[PDB]
Write a protein that binds this ligand. Structure first.
Ligand SMILES: NC1N[C@H](N)NC(=O)C1CCC[C@@H](c1ccc(C(=O)N[C@@H](CCC(=O)O)C(=O)O)cc1)C(O)(O)C(F)(F)F
Length: 200
């Protein structure tokens, strides 16, 4: 399968995906990396790996549908089968999500359905959980609410900051995201017609 990775920052998840798709017997290859923000480290990681990049600046579009179409054009240009959202920070419009239904994955740093949203760690610390984790899910219209592919629990330590908890959880993300991509790229895991996850 030909894979696009969308990013908005550092690209540590991207990196782990790059490394795993290049292990032998991989069912996936990353063919394009797209950022909605300029000068992010994720772009350097892509180019150092010999993978083409684009910056599609979301602030230059009148609305989300048009920004999403600019992304979609690049995905067509590159004959993309599967899209990975790896620290991508833009909510995607209805028709884009529908088009990519069953073919677009996201990494989220909590055990869904707890702590939906971009500040999951801040919420986890406020709430006082001793166990959090991360989740790979198919992307649905509803934010952080698509069908769950894989999850991994991660302990919260007494005295954790957003930074320390975030680093511990990234360690788990870098395991399950590549594993989930392989599962989908190989057709082992599919979004079924009944809207539910299917393992073959
Ligand atoms: N891109 C998606 N589109 C749709 N329709 N459904 C999804 O499930 C997507 C996956 C969302 C992934 C995450 C997520 C949740 C909320 C936002 C959000 O509020 N974005 C704002 C911009 C916020 C900002 O600049 O800080 C904005 O206005 O776009 C950004 C990302 C995530 O919480 O899981 C995390 F961890 F990635 F942040």
């Amino acid at each position: 399968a030909r894979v696009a990775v969308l990013i908005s920052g550092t690209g540590s998840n991207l990196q782990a995906l790059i490394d795993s798709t290049r292990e032998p017997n991989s069912s996936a290859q990353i063919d394009i990396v797209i950022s909605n923000k300029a000068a992010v480290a994720g772009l350097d990681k892509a180019e150092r790996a010999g993978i083409p990049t684009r910056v599609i600046n979301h602030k230059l579009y009148k609305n989300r549908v048009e920004f999403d179409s600019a992304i979609d054009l690049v995905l067509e240009e590159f004959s993309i089968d599967i899209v990975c959202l790896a620290g991508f920070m833009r909510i995607l419009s209805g028709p884009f999500v529908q088009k990519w239904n069953g073919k677009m994955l996201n990494i989220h740093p909590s055990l869904l359905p707890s702590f939906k949203g971009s500040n999951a760690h801040e919420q986890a610390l406020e709430t006082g959980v001793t166990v959090t984790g991360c989740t790979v899910h198919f992307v649905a219209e509803d934010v952080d609410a698509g069908q769950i592919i894989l999850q991994e629990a991660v302990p919260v330590k007494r005295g954790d900051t957003v930074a320390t908890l975030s680093e511990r959880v990234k360690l788990a993300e870098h395991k399950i995201f590549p594993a989930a991509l392989q599962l989908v790229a190989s057709g082992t895991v599919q979004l079924g017609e009944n809207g539910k996850i299917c393992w073959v």
